[PDB]
Amino acid sequence: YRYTGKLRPHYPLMPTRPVPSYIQRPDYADHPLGMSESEQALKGTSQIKLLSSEDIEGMRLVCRLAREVLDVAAGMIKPGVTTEEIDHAVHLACIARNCYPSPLNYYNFPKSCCTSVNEVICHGIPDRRPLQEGDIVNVDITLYRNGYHGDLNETFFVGEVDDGARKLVQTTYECLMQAIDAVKPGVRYRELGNIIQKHAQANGFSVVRSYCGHGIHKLFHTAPNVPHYAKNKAVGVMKSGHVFTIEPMICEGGWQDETWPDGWTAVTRDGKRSAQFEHTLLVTDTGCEILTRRLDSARPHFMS
């Protein structure tokens, strides 16, 4: 394999971390290939669930806990910490909240979170590499509690970063929030990418096309698919009671991606940097509830 930038994987990985059996597990956690037969049974649909009041309380809970776990990871970002050390803290933080770390064994993903440094677009595997001053790193968290998943991510600065990194991360966050500010009953899901791309392109950046926001509730991913680029063909109209993510991946150079031989790590083909932010949203009767928001502080960690 010809690497696209300076990053390399730092092996070996630790053996997979067990989750105590008192923690409730999603179907795929015990499947030998990590397949989710509840996702498979619904493979085949654009129909979107309307959540019950019961489901809304379960989503509110797991999303608040997921935010608490992202905040634990945020407090670890400093030069010299390895991404495996971040993952270990996340794993234990999930278990302390009586939650399963949804990534773990999902289609045999080997870790409890994704850590995406520099040219990694998404799904980076925590490994032995120490963070370096000047890096940007995304940590993506998903928890499972009482049959519900909750999903969020933020990009962080590692010590001092250059102006390009600041502009990329700020723009990506602004893309997410402009999209969120448009969510309300009656808006087509395909509109959000028109908003995102407009702001990215105005700032000289590109939008990843191979990954999208997703419905999330009893399944980790389900309908709707929410592309982040303009003039997409997404199906559906937002209604109160829909729950889904918005998770734009914005790149310094071109938008084209490729995957490492590990089968997960998505990188820019040109080796330039990418950033991402994500929230889980509930559509309400007149707008949206940001389930994964910070309750205690005004701004994302990179601005705090």
Rounded to an integer, what distance in angstroms lies between the CA atom of residue 2 and that of residue 188? 40
- What's the min distance (Å) between Cβ of 248 and ligand OVA? 10
Site for ligand OVA (CB under 6 A): which residue of 103, 110, 193, 236?
103
Three-state SS at 65: helix
The entry of ligand OVA, Co ion, K ion, none near residue 123 (CB within 5 to 8 angstroms by kind) is ligand OVA
Using CB under 6 A as the binding rule, whether residue 109 contacts ligand OVA is answered as: yes
- What's the min distance (Å) between Cβ of 219 and Co ion? 8
Rounded to an integer, what distance in angstroms lies between the CA atom of residue 196 and that of residue 177? 9
Contact assessment for residue 247 and residue 148, using Cβ atoms and an 8 Å cutoff: no
Nearer to ligand OVA, 161 or 249 (CB): 249
Nearer to ligand OVA, 161 or 243 (CB): 243
3-state secondary structure 119-175: CEEECCCCCCCECCCCCEEEEEEEEEECCEEEEEEEEEECCCCCHHHHHHHHHHHHH
The Cα-based distances of 141 to 47, 78, 134, 166, 175 in angstroms read 26, 18, 23, 22, 20
Nearer to Co ion, 27 or 262 (CB): 27
Site string for ligand OVA, 214-233 (x = CB under 6 A): x-----xx------------
Nearer to Co ion, 97 or 163 (CB): 97
Using CB under 6 A as the binding rule, whether residue 212 contacts ligand OVA is answered as: yes
- What's the min distance (Å) between Cβ of 167 and ligand OVA? 23
Q: Whole-angstrom distance between the N-terminal and C-terminal Cα of the chain?
A: 39
Q: Which stretch binds ligand OVA (CB under 6 A): 60-68, 75-83, 210-218, 253-261?
A: 210-218
> If binding means CB under 5 A, how many residues of this protein chain bind K ion?
3
Token pair for 242:
């829909």
Q: Greatest CA span in the chain, whole angstroms?
A: 50
Q: In terms of DSSP H, where are the helices of the chain?
A: 37-41, 53-74, 83-96, 163-181, 191-202
The entry of Co ion, ligand OVA, K ion, none near residue 109 (CB within 5 to 8 angstroms by kind) is ligand OVA
Rounded to an integer, what distance in angstroms lies between the CA atom of residue 52 and that of residue 238? 16
Site string for ligand OVA, 247-266 (x = CB under 6 A): x-------------------
Token pair for 5:
């930038």
Using CB under 5 A as the binding rule, whether residue 206 contacts K ion is answered as: no
Site string for ligand OVA, 49-88 (x = CB under 6 A): ----------------------------------------
Rounded to an integer, what distance in angstroms lies between the CA atom of residue 149 and that of residue 65? 10
The entry of Co ion, K ion, ligand OVA, none near residue 39 (CB within 5 to 8 angstroms by kind) is Co ion
Residues belonging to the binding site for Zn(2+) are 140, 151, 214, 247, 278
Q: Which residues are annotated as a binding site?
A: 123, 140, 151, 214, 221, 247, 278
